[PDB]
Curated annotation (Swiss-Prot), chains A, B:
Entry protein name: Streptavidin
Positions of biotin binding: 30, 39, 77, 93, 105
Motif interval(s): Cell attachment site: 44-46
GO cellular component, one term: extracellular region
Span within the parent record: 38 to 180 of 183
Residue ranges constituting the Avidin-like domain according to the UniProt record: 1-120
Amino acid sequence: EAGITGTWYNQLGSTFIVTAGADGALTGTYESANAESRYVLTGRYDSAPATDGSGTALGWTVAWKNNYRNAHSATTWSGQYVGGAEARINTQWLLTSGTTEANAWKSTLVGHDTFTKVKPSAASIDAAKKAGVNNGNPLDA
Amino acid sequence: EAGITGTWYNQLGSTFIVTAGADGALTGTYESANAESRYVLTGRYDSAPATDGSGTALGWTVAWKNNYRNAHSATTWSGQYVGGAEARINTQWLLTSGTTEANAWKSTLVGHDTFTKVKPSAASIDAAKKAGVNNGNPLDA
Amino acid sequence: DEAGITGTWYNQLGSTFIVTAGADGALTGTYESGNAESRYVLTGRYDSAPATDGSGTALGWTVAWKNNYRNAHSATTWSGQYVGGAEARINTQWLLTSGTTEANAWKSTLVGHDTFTKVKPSAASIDAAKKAGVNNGNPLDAVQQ
Amino acid sequence: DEAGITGTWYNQLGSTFIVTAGADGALTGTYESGNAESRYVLTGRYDSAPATDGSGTALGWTVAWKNNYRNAHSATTWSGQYVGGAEARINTQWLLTSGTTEANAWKSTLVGHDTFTKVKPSAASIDAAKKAGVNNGNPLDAVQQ
């Protein structure tokens, strides 16, 4: 809640800006390390998590359309928030593109992203970058 | 848009009630074949799809908390809408439970759901049911 | 399950795999789209002693999409379970990973699902499947049309 | 890649697999959590002639979680790619499917990711990994503690 609301950064400096509402809503924007690269997001989170050391389940969606570009696709992230001095949101994502029926087999990509509250540097932003980046962001996005 | 807004039914009679807004918002509820089993959903969809026979990309999230139960989990569906006389929404989903760090390996289930606009019968609602149902709905939900 | 799994399996698009289930848990065979150019080696594992409570039989297999004719520089894994009976079926989830550059790693893996039965589908069935959007885990480029 | 893949690989929690890459594309070996009771047969496939453009080497493998000691009635597949070099690495996505009843089929398959390198992690590294939430694709019940 207090912990989820705010700005989050992935492995590559992509930026997730989110407000967690009292009622379980997630609202915000997803962008790159640029208004051309900013997209609306919305989701849900468990607003009354267990108090046993478990993470807080959540998920959200970005449709990759804004006033500048349309990639005809949408990503959903499913994951959990873990608070603390090194707070993280660990996720798995699915990126589905609109396709014809014949191409439906290649409609959905899968991956994983970890978000933290401190912006990374180009060192760990490029090394880790050579480690295999995992944006669920289509290039056009 | 006109085509996505409305009530959708999965393989097992689970019910997805959604409004597609002009701006790309999805808002609605997810429920069983019961207010105890109704949960808020929110998502995004491509409000300006290609006109080449491709589907419309979309996704949405349910956090499995309502005023009756809390499963401490959230499902995201990623998929595409295909319109027509047998309109469908084909999806893949991820169900992540809040877990401790040690149990994070079993935090996320994966599956697939197809939604159509006509409510199925118990025949095809139980056969197809013996065919292996795929709700992304945790039991407590 | 050794006897129940061994044999030819079809998806609803007609893709075919031929597998031998070994007593030791091995799965060995081929996956094909009809012709040799579309046929690939498969190998995997299955639970050779599953629970005796009505549960399915966990299994998985891999196909690397290289044979003596073509190479799609990719590989698919299928993870799922066998259910025996007069309508025996293998329900799976698959992952198709392509070799890519580092920059393209994030878009290296497709995910999908597919179901196999022992009954060859008719063109009819094959036509409605295609209609319900194709679910195969083979890349089209593995297919010699 | 036959030479680069053959050998022992570790995840950041210390799980280990030992694989031989055959010239023909086969992957053969074992997966273990230290002791025999936690060791399982693996088999898979890899692209034995990958692209010559900087791309990785597509591969996959399966482990059914049955050995001579225990049986978890499940199987995992890993799909991913090998990247060679002084910091050689195998990046994967995995699917862990348990045999279940029909009613529980919807919750039969876990998904996750894991990365392997040729360097055994220290307890330190192992401790921060555990901290960053465990990513292994083996069920705990496959592990003899």
